[PDB]
Amino acid sequence: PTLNDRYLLLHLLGRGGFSEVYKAFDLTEQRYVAVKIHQLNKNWRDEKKENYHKHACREYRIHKELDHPRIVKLYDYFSLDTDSFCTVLEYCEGNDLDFYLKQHKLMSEKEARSIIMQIVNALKYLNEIKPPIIHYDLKPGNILLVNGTACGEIKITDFGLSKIMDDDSYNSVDGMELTSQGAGTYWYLPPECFVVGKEPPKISNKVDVWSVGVIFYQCLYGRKPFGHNQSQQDILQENTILKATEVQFPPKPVVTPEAKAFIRRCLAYRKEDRIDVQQLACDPYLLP
Ligand SMILES: Nc1ncnc2c1ncn2[C@@H]1O[C@H](COP(=O)(O)OP(=O)(O)OP(O)(O)=S)[C@@H](O)[C@H]1O
Secondary structure: OEOOOOOEEEEEEEEOOOEEEEEEEEOOOOEEEEEEEEEOOOOOOOHHHHHHHHHHHHHHHHHHOOOOOOEOOEEEEEEOOOOEEEEEEEOOOOEEHHHHHHHHOOOOHHHHHHHHHHHHHHHHHHOOOOOOEEOOOOOHHHEEEOOOOOOOOEEEOOOOOOEEOOOOOOOOOOOEEOOOOOOOOHHHOOHHHHOOOOOOOEEOOHHHHHHHHHHHHHHHHOOOOOOOOOOHHHHHHHOOOOOOOOOOOOOOOOOOHHHHHHHHHHOOOOHHHOOOHHHHOOOHHHOO
């Protein structure tokens, strides 16, 4: 059942919110790929059609140019009718870290560290690239365990909320104005992102550092460090992330105090006290 004159569709892999993902065989390259067929809507008409389209096309143009083994590769885009289009991706086996933590609750430190070093290498690449990127949505749902194991390989994905640190937007003194305040998953976002006032927050790649701290903590203890049993609307109501001034560690399971010291470096409340991605990428804890 072939698409774009190459793209022979084999079977379903999964469903997104408004998409279906098929395993396909790329007849020209002669490799297996994932075709994600985006299907909207017939009754959103006009306004919500085009800003869903440009959100998708924006993500596509960021993600297309990324070439690194710890980031899922994006091969192609093409439209079908007016109300649907496809993106074509590197075919990845296994499930994601969110699913893994549902089955197995937590993991070992050696395993949790194995994942974090890999994530950090992706972040180092995103901060070496042609205008640097903040991957604003780092979370277990966007970390694929491609070998089906925690000790094995991982890759990151989903640049829908990702901010571009170009010269118009960003400088190293101030950082960049937060574009779309309220977006993203609040457990993995830092305190500065929740301040509401006259002017929007100023952010940098230090929001990804906070995410890494939270994700690592979650892998070790099987619980999130802030707002564990709280919805998104609860987090905002209670300002639980603005109160996240000191991170506590349950006595079980045992983690090294070097691991705990690493988490405190990543989860520094005040962004000026927090290490940036460059400094995270040469953190002593992560040295082989
Ligand atoms: N590169 C890939 N390789 C294999 N399977 C994939 C790949 N990308 C997506 N899938 C499958 O598609 C399912 C959901 O697609 P995702 O795009 O990850 O979800 P989503 O972000 O909610 O989708 P939206 O809402 O349309 S952006 C996953 O559970 C996978 O099984």
